[PDB]
Amino acid sequence: SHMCDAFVGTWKLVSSENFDDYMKEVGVGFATRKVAGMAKPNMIISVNGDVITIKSESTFKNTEISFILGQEFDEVTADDRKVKSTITLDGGVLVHVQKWDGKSTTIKRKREDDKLVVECVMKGVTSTRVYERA
């Protein structure tokens, strides 16, 4: 048993708050916000040795990242930003920081009861996305 055991699995989005405004804050245009906002992605988290893989799949877009904790990597986000990302574990929370064009946003992933809770923060705007086991 290891670092991210309680995250591993397939998770389905069930609820969202303030995600349109989060997207606005990160620069997403109107049409992409409206289409992406409908999506109910599946987030599939797996671990192989030190490598964590997070796949996020929806009608809108499929994304896949693999990484080692603390080790920066290139990411193309679902909204097509080209960012430098680092993911760390801080007190049992996966903390995903994305840097691009002098800007920064943080996505936190946390296990809470039987849910996986995702908080996306850009400046003063926070959005919460709640996932259940698929």
CB nearer to ligand WIL: give 3 or 119.
119
Q: Is 130 annotated as a binding residue?
A: yes
Token pair, residue 80, equals 């097509």
d(CA 8, CA 17): 24
Q: Is 22 annotated as a binding residue?
A: no
CB nearer to ligand WIL: give 4 or 39.
39
Minimum distance, C-beta of residue 120 to ligand WIL, in the bound complex (Å) = 6
CB nearer to ligand WIL: give 10 or 58.
58
Minimum distance, C-beta of residue 1 to ligand WIL, in the bound complex (Å) = 26
Beta bridge partner(s), residue 10: 44
3-state SS, residue 28: coil
Q: Is 129 annotated as a binding residue?
A: yes
CB nearer to ligand WIL: give 21 or 79.
79
Residue type, 26: V
Token pair, residue 106, equals 């943080």
d(CA 107, CA 75): 14
Residues of this chain that bind ligand WIL (CB under 6 A): 23, 26, 28, 32, 36, 39, 41, 56, 58, 60-61, 63, 77-79, 84, 99, 102, 104
Element (DSSP H or E) covering residue 72:
none
Minimum distance, C-beta of residue 40 to ligand WIL, in the bound complex (Å) = 8
d(CA 13, CA 125): 20
As annotated, the binding site for a fatty acid includes 129-131
